[model samples]
Target: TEPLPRIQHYEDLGLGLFIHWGLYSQMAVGEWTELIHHRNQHDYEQLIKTFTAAQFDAKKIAHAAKAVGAKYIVLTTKHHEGFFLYDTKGLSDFDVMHAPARRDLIAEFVAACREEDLLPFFYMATYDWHTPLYDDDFPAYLTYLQKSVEVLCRNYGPVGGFWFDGNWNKKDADWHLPELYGMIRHYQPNAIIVNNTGVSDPEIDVVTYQRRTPDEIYHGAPNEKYVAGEISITLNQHWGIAANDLNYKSPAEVIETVAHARHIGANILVNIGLTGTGAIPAAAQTYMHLLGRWTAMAAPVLYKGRPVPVTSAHGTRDFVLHTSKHDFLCILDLQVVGNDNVVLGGEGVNPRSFVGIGQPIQRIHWLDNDEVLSFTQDLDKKVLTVDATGYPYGSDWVVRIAQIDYE
Candidate 1:
């Protein structure tokens, strides 16, 4: 069967927020801190006693994601460590309900998302280190997995989707995906199904590229039916918070990454690692605000426009996104000064040319400031060469967009 209308609607969201948080946050290392360090099970389980979560603010988290222009937020309901953020309702003794927090974190998260009008997507791990049945009784493990998903689907009150991971651990094993997917559809028919695997599958609703740089993302070939593309990346090298991790992406790098994803019509899921106390890191917050500012300025172009196949005459990285009424021309790595004019001359004097416009050009101007840009057009060749001077003084957007109106 083909994808439903909701799946197509999801593609228009453009940006989402992926959160990786669990016991690993307490360790202040990485998501795989327990497994990679080979810590004793009993000792690692003890960490939950101190997980008071005094600073865990679901509403604030939702607002922060909204500020970053994320349409949806995905929370780690269960990570590889096998601790549950929801009240398993006696399904398992190891969960946040049993933690010092003494409450269901997932419930609070869902309510927060609803309050902010943000779709709530749950992230679950198929790989478990605490459950011995995974290696000993494989079929039983699958049954456990289905029940876990059922709980999330039936109780969450219309989730946006489910993000599954760790299936790569046992690729050859029969995952019984049809049954799992059927169970999800039975409860939340509109929910999207996504796996970390980049491969296309009949049952999968969305394909994911994990941690791939925006420049390196590959959407692969066309599918028999409509399948969406998503690129999930962390702000830093680690998914979970690490006190020593300081190599966060610069504002320009993030702006470029989002712009690139938009050029290909793929959704970008920017990640933020909450600290052990369930508070967003200060550095991550700053970047989120910066992204919000840019997204607000480029909202119409990023979400409403579709990518058009064309090349710039002079600039290698220039591309275009077209809508019914306007064409958004994007210039990447644009050089600008606080107060000056710079020129680019291809072979001596350089101006950018865009070919393949099927409509008659009426006018062109910068989206950031609405400044009219001078250009000359060849009506016969359907080509337009723009006066691609440096950005107007006193501004430097990481990527500059021009609004081209055609008659």
Candidate 2:
């Protein structure tokens, strides 16, 4: 039997949860705020001294991700500060074993993920400014870093993949890519590796683009053969607790982003920065929960689906796509009209020939009902006029255009 074409390359694992927690969360500055602000080692160390996970429950966090329809969980095993969330023989003092929260956070996180049947992935920092070896002794730092990688691959039962960050700063050092890949493969043969730089290598399985996603479908190099590219974005600029951080993105916006990424054949890695106490803010948690509910409702058309041809009068937003099933039109942004109608592109294009044209639309429902009310499509111009009066201005909306008989 021929294999089915998947929007997302990985076994149809549509959505993933990215957790950014470490010593930086303790400081409440941000994920990389410590490096940006040039906080002294002592000050950073002091922040960790107060770090306590008394309220932190890995199982709770994992359950939350599962509830939200996340198929995989990627935790920051180490951030740019060179702090390890797991036990490591390479680093003596800066790991979880040495921190005030003297607990193997990674172990707990992995255990919870396994219990929830979510694939576990590790995020490792390639750039380390806090490690004495990175600044004081290059050779020593490389050795320590390699050893830490070994511990992660060996100790962790089996990781879904490895995410490497901060490689921009490693231009001067020998990346030892061959050695690292060997280690990763030897320990976890099924695990994939993502290189942020997009350098094509047999060992590297994916290209990771940070923050924003591309506009259209992207097929990575065949020789390199990435299992899937990924986009990692945050609710706000800071990955950790922020006093006045008000950059919360609405569920609609997030849905739009995820749809756009899926159309482009990439996975969306939505990130949430936990506070020093290892708890996600109530606001953030609520937003994700809502987003998960929306994803669940539209899973038939959105999750691991294909792109359909879209016809509209407004041309097309960089975020919309038609599924491969050739039966539905997935709308990414419904706020372009701001509580008004959004005209889809397709003036010269034939609407009847389009995927859902001439076919009965089984159900016309909003991706998020509370966020978007309903929509109407003009077959002549192939334009979809959305009724978003009941929705918020910044939120995203997804509409499924399908034949009534589509089952």
Candidate 3:
């Protein structure tokens, strides 16, 4: 509710791609190589000298994201390891410029987004394990973090958002979140500020229940203000690049996750860690293309409009999405079956008033196929049944309903 024009735009933006690359990516296990393996901080900083992003092609990344149906790309300007992608002036010598990269990765990324007409967002670390100041001068370290955040916001031009993490390391410390939030607001008023440490305050724009499906999170907000939901999940267990981590989400799970996010009126971002050479992992790219091809079928309704209210379900796990002109009933056929029936009205949507607010739904058709589909409506029972005969099995199907006579 805190001046949510930009926040709402972000929600409507839907699918986003996140990068978790850093000095840790050099190890190819994950981004937490320093902390998890308890490597010497000085030794870890030494990686920067040889950390060459020779293959870090920003334009190629932007084009790849567009093909995958991601409206925006969020990169790790800085992760918990404290290696800054952009030159953090005077903050420390540990940055991409000071390192062998010798260029501002963030600047290149923003330019790439502009060329591809994609929005750019940044992922920054609120907790720094490498900085001795984190424990040495707790309060001053907060200032140091603020300065880094300021650099990210001011230097990047108009960024879409900032995805933050690592705040959980200091539970009792006074993070001065309002001040940090205020800085973002000053630099880019509409830039979304998200804390990934499982901390939610009013200042934090979007609320996240990490790894849960979007509908699973929005079900609790019925008859409420829709506090704005986002689901950030990874292809594998690790957020950073893992050469050995082959545990990828199946194509079905990936597409189904996007559908659920749309059904609940929320945005979802999938994490993919990059190699030290700055190439997107092959499995990650493969999964993205898979998800993209799946979403292409329902692109019209999925990205353009708001999700209609379906207060109840006939069996389980099916819903409706509403645009300015049409109603798209999404059936989640998790198990293969013949047809699915959905009831309207009663404790569900008020059909009479809904018709008044929007145009009456007159015709029904399959979005996948161009054939028209017929449905029967029972006024007394307030039920609408669509004969989903020729639809596919064991996945999701989209039925488009065009406006007809108002009931």
Candidate 4:
């Protein structure tokens, strides 16, 4: 299906913060803790007694995302474990109201997003482990699912979108997606609908790349296609807090992913698993702070620039990002030391030289520091070479972005 204006707007957003918080956070394991540990339904349900969510501050979460240069947020409203974060109100006895928190978490989240001027998207899982109807009466389970979705549609004012998950678990079963999607469209005309059909839907506004790399998804060719795509990745191995999952991606890796996503005409959704108390973990905050610093400097090219094939002399990662006002030369893989001389062909920096420019260059300067670079543009051969260098001492953004102005 063709993308809606909202979908187009979503793609322009570039970065979204994903939150995987629920009762699963209490387990301090993964989102699939119940199934993985074979815990009984009653035992799993009783954990709500201790579900205070004391530190789950919507405003704080919203501000954290905004600080990280995220344009939107995708909060997990309900995971496969089938516990609701909002006030289900007579729809079911298993929800936040029944727990000790007794407050509608989703409501707070939506308000916080609006206050921060960020879009809020709900992540809903269709495959329920709590509801017995899922196994006994399949059709009845669909009805329950629709009613749950209806609650979100009617209660949450205007939702930015609904990210449906777990449908892949029941491939043969009838999901009644058209009816579900129709209700969403009826309630919120501007909402973008996304289904994580596992790397692989109707009026599905966005195609998701779950834990996939840029090279795997983008094949440079045709140069004339727009796919509303999102790359969802986690900070660590688990989507929920594991407490011991220390194998986290560094700030450079995260920045590189976001940069590459923008280069390929897609949005990047970086996830963080909140602690049981709902506070963002220290490790996550540290990386996000670093990411925010990098994004603050790279916002112009990261948000407005479009990918264009401008070959460089030596580096495979070097390319050009074109904007209406100027172009950006993105140079990757540089190790900036304390040395004063750090340019293309320097020991740690790769050789950088543009082979095609279609236009005469007026000026070129680094975005991190407006240092006017020396360049030799052979317009006769449509080749442009610039003295691209690494970040100065005490500064390393992993990727060096330079603004290219055309005469």
Question: Model-by-model lDDT, in order?
Answer: 0.82, 0.67, 0.74, 0.84
Model 2 weakest lDDT span, ten residues long: 346-355
- Across 1-407, the per-residue lDDT of candidate 2 in tens digits comes to 22223323353676788888877876666777776888787777666567676667999999999887888888888888777788886455777777678889889988999999888889888788677677788777777777888888888798877888765775656777888888888988778677776363567766677876676534454553435667777887766666577877776678777766777767778888887778977877986887787777767655546554554344555323444543444543333333225543321222222223543343444444423224455456555544323233444345333222222
Clash pairs detected, candidate 4: none
lDDT (10s digit) by residue, model 1, range 161-223: 999998999878878888998899889999888888635356677888787654433444555
**Model 3: which ten-residue window has the lowest total lDDT?**
347-356
Indicate whether candidate 1 or candidate 2 has the larger TM-score. 1
| Candidate ordering by lDDT (highest first) | 4, 1, 3, 2
Model 3 spans with C-alpha error above 4 angstroms? 1-3, 199-201, 214-227, 311-313, 334-360, 391-407
RMSD of each: 2.8, 5.8, 5.8, 2.9
What's the true lDDT of residue 23 in model 1? 86
lDDT of 4: 0.84
RMSD of 2: 5.8
For model 4, how does the per-residue alpha-carbon lDDT over 1-407 read when each residue is reduced to its tens digit?
33456766887788999999888898888989999999987988888888888999999999999999999999998888888999887888888899899899999999999999999999999989999999999899999998898999999899888899988898887788888889888898888788887722446777788898755343212442334788988988999889878798877899999888877778899999998879999988998999999888898887777767766676368777888899888888766645446433333533478876878888989899898887787788878777666567678888789898877
Q: Cα lDDT of model 2 overall?
A: 0.67
Clashes of each: 3, 23, 4, 0
Clashing pairs in 3: 360-404, 361-404, 362-403, 362-404
Choose the strongest candidate by lDDT.
Answer: 4
Sliding window of 10 residues with minimal summed lDDT for model 1:
340-349
TM match of model 3 to true structure: 0.86
